[PDB]
Amino acid sequence: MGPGFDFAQAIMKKNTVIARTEKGEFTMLGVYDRVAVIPTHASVGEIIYINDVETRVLDACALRDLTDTNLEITIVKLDRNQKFRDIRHFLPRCEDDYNDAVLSVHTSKFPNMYIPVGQVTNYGFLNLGGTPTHRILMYNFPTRAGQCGGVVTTTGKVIGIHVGGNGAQGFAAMLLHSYFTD
Numbered sequence: 001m002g003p004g005f006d007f008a009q010a011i012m013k014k015n016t017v018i019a020r021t022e023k024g025e026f027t028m029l030g031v032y033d034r035v036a037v038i039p040t041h042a043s044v045g046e047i048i049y050i051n052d053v054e055t056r057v058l059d060a061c062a063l064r065d066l067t068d069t070n071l072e073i074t075i076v077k078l079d080r081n082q083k084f085r086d087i088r089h090f091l092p093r094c095e096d097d098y099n100d101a102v103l104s105v106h107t108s109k110f111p112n113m114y115i116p117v118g119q120v121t122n123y124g125f126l127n128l129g130g131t132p133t134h135r136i137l138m139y140n141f142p143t144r145a146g147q148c149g150g151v152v153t154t155t156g157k158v159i160g161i162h163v164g165g166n167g168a169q170g171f172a173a174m175l176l177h178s179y180f181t182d
């Protein structure tokens with residue numbers, strides 16, 4: 001409807017796949033080459049389904065900060081025959097707050113879904129499903145089940161992936177450029 005939705009759509013149409021694990025269907029953001037991200041609670045194993053195609057997982061790393069605290073991001077390298085468009089230049093370098101974000105989801109259940117979530121706070125610490133978690137972004141939107149892995153963007157930046165909510169607020173794990181240096 002506006003330039004926020006324009007940038008979100010541009011990311012969704014080229015840099016997302018539908019990922020299916022034994023824990024459900026997730027929006028999955030492809031970042032560069034065959035490297036993608038997904039919430040760690042997706043529990044990626046040796047095989048994952050990508051757009052309903054059986055795909056070998058070449059590597060999967062559940063990220064933690066240097067305090068050894070959960071970040072709720074898993075970086076997956078996929079045995080896919082095609083590279084993602086490289087979007088690492090849209091990732092923030094530092095932890096920050098943002099104005100006017102969009103949460104975008106694409107699954108069987110929620111195709112072509114875009115939500116204007118408004119202001120995004122650097123929330124920091126969250127007890128997420130009982131697990132201490134750092135680098136959390138918060139937005140005042142009542143997100144539900146089905147949105148995990150959704151991409152959080154501003155104009156020009158990809159800032160996070162949706163990992164949970166409390167019925168009133170939604171929570172995203174930060175994406176930082178430093179996670180994807182090769």
Ligand SMILES: CNc1ccccc1S(C)(=O)=O
Nearest residue numbers: 110115142143144145146147
């Ligand atoms: C994904 N949530 C959803 C889905 C269908 C209808 C309404 C909603 S909402 C975000 O407005 O509570």
